[PDB]
C-alpha cells in the first residue's frame, strides 16, 4: 500500500511507522546494501527500482539529495507514470521545483515535503505542490508526522524548511559562541543553561511584538533605538575579544548594525536592519 | 545604618531605582548633569545634590546608573577624594574587563564596590519578579543585599567583579545574533512572497524549541565531548550551504549566514567532520590556533 526509497535517518523512521499499520510496503536503497530487518514486519525489497516503483502508486523519496533522485529514477522513467512521488528533501526551493517538473514530464504526480524533525520525530511537515494530489494522500502522510500544506509552488515546502534552518543554525551558534565566552570567564555550560534557555524562550515575545510593524514596513524607535542596539553589540564584540574568543560571528552582527547606522536609521528600531538585508 | 541612598545617573533606569527607594522609605539624594531630569523625583521627596562632591558625601551607599564606565570616570574622577568608605553599585552594562578595572580603581580610592547587570527595563524595577546579576566581594554584597532587593531580586554570581557584566553580555550575544537571523529569515520569506505574519508561527516555534536542543547538548558540551551520534558537522555545513544558496536566490544579503558557514568551514578543516556540530565551540575557543 506504500513504498519507501532511501533507508536511513528519516527513511526507516518512516518504514517502521508504516509497516505498523498494514500497507504492502516495498523498499530499496541506493548503495543496494542490507538494512532489511524491516522484512520482519511485511516488506518486500525489489532487486531494482523498476519493480519497487510498479509495486504501489504512492512512493516516498528520502534521498541524500536531489542529484541522487535523477540517478536512480532515470533508468525507470517509463514507470514513474501514474505514480505519486512524495519527495522529502532538505534542498533549496529551485531544486525542488526543478525536480517537480522533471517528474511531471514523466506523467507522475508529486508532493514536495519539508520534514521539521529528526527521525525520532516520526511533529509537523511542510508540504507543497498540486493541492488535489496532496489532499488525496493526506491521511497516509499524517501517519508519519502532522501535515502543513503551504500552497501550490513545489518549492514552498523547501523554502519554509530553509528559513527555519536559517534561524536554527544562526541562533544555535550564537549559543555555542556565548558558551565559549562563558567558559573562558570560568562559568560552566551547566551553570549557563538556564540563562541561555530564558533568552531563547524570550524571543517569541519580541517576534510577536515586531511582526506587525515589520509587516507594515514601519520601524519607529519608540521602544528601542538602533544606536543603543549598536553600542550594545560593540560591548559584545569587546567582551568576546577580551575573553580570547573568535569574534567573526558577532562581528558579522556588528557589520549589519553599522550599515543601518550609515543609512540614517540610528533613531529607528533595530528591526529596520531588515532593510539592510534586502540590500537597500 | 539608616535608610538613605544616593543615585547617580538619572536616565530612565536611575529615575526608576530612585522612585523605588523613595516608595520604600529611603531618604534619596540624586545627581545628574542636566539638573531638571530630577524634577518629578524631587516632587516625590528626593533631594538633589547640586554637585558630585555633595552627592557622594550624602550617603555611604551610592547607586550608579551610567551609560558605561567611561561615564563613571568622567564624573567620579574629579571627586576621587570622597570615594573613601563608600560602597558604589555600578549598574551599567559594559564589558567584564571594564568592570574589573573599575572595581580596582574604586578600591584604590578606598571604596567598596558591587557590580550589577540589570535584566529588565526601567519599569520592571520594584517588582520582585525581576532579577539583577550582582558580582564582587561577597561580604560587601551580603551587607547590602536587603537594600538592593528594593529594586529587584538579586542573583549574586560570585567574587569576580566582572561576572555580572559577563552574564548580561552573553545573553546579548545570543539575543542580537538570534534576532538578526529572524530578520534575515523574514527578508528571505518576504522576497519569496510570504509575509511576516504568515512566517510568525514558524519563527516563534523555532526560537521556542531551542531550549530543548540546548538542554540536550549541555551535559556533553559541559564535559567537553562532541560525539556524532545524533548530528554530524559535515551534514550541518551542507545544511548551512543550502541556506546560503536560498538566501542568494532571493537576492538577500549573505553576510549573516556566510559568517555561520565560515565557522563550520574552520571545523571541517580541523578534522571534526564526524563530531557533533557543537564541537564548533572549540573553534570559538581557538583550540585550533597556537598559544
UniProtKB/TrEMBL annotation, chain B:
Pfam families: NAD_binding_2, RedAm-like_C. GO terms for cellular component: chromatin. InterPro entries: 6PGD_dom2, 6PGDH_NADP-bd, HIBADH-related, HIBADH-related_NP60_sf, NAD(P)-bd_dom_sf, RedAm-like_C. It comes from the Bacteria. One of its GO terms (molecular function) is nucleosome binding. Keywords: Oxidoreductase. GO terms for biological process: transcription elongation-coupled chromatin remodeling. Residues 5-151 form the 6-phosphogluconate dehydrogenase NADP-binding domain. Residues 160-286 form the NADPH-dependent reductive aminase-like C-terminal domain. Belongs to the HIBADH-related family. PANTHER family: CYTOKINE-LIKE NUCLEAR FACTOR N-PAC, OXIDOREDUCTASE GLYR1-RELATED. This is 6-phosphogluconate dehydrogenase. It comes from Paenibacillus mucilaginosus K02.
Amino acid at each position: 500500500s506504500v513504498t519507501v526509497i532511501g533507508l536511513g535517518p528519516m527513511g526507516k523512521a518512516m518504514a517502521a511507522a508504516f509497516l505498523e499499520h498494514g500497507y504492502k510496503v516495498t523498499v530499496w536503497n541506493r548503495t543496494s546494501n542490507k538494512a532489511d530487518e524491516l522484512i520482519t514486519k511485511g516488506a518486500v525489497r525489489a532487486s531494482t527500482v523498476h519493480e519497487a516503483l510498479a509495486a504501489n502508486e504512492l512512493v516516498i523519496l528520502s534521498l541524500t539529495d536531489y542529484d541522487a533522485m535523477y540517478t536512480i529514477l532515470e533508468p525507470a522513467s517509463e514507470n514513474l507514470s501514474g505514480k505519486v512521488l512524495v519527495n522529502l528533501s532538505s534542498d533549496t526551493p529551485d531544486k525542488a521545483r526543478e525536480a517537480a517538473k522533471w517528474l511531471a514530464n514523466r506523467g507522475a504526480g508529486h508532493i514536495t515535503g519539508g520534514v521539521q524533525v529528526p527521525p525520532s520525530g516520526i511533529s509537523s511537515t511542510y508540504y507543497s505542490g498540486p493541492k488535489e494530489v496532496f489532499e488525496a494522500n493526506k491521511e497516509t502522510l499524517e501517519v508519519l508526522t502532522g501535515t502543513d500544506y503551504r500552497g501550490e509552488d513545489p518549492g514552498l515546502a523547501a523554502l519554509y524548511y530553509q528559513i527555519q534552518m536559517d534561524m536554527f543554525w544562526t541562533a544555535m551558534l550564537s549559543y555555542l559562541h556565548a558558551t565559549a565566552v562563558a567558559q573562558a570567564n570560568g562559568i560552566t555550560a551547566e551553570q549557563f543553561l538556564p540563562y541561555a534557555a530564558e533568552t531563547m524562550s524570550s524571543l517569541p515575545k519580541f517576534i510577536e511584538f515586531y511582526t506587525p510593524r515589520i509587516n507594515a514596513g514601519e520601524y519607529p524607535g519608540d521602544v528601542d533605538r538602533l544606536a543603543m542596539g549598536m553600542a550594545s553589540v560593540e560591548h559584545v564584540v569587546h567582551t568576546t575579544q577580551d575573553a580570547g574568543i573568535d569574534i567573526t560571528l558577532p562581528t558579522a552582527v556588528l557589520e549589519v548594525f553599522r550599515r543601518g547606522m550609515e543609512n540614517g536609521h540610528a533613531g529607528n528600531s533595530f528591526t529596520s536592519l531588515i532593510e539592510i538585508f534586502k540590500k537597500s
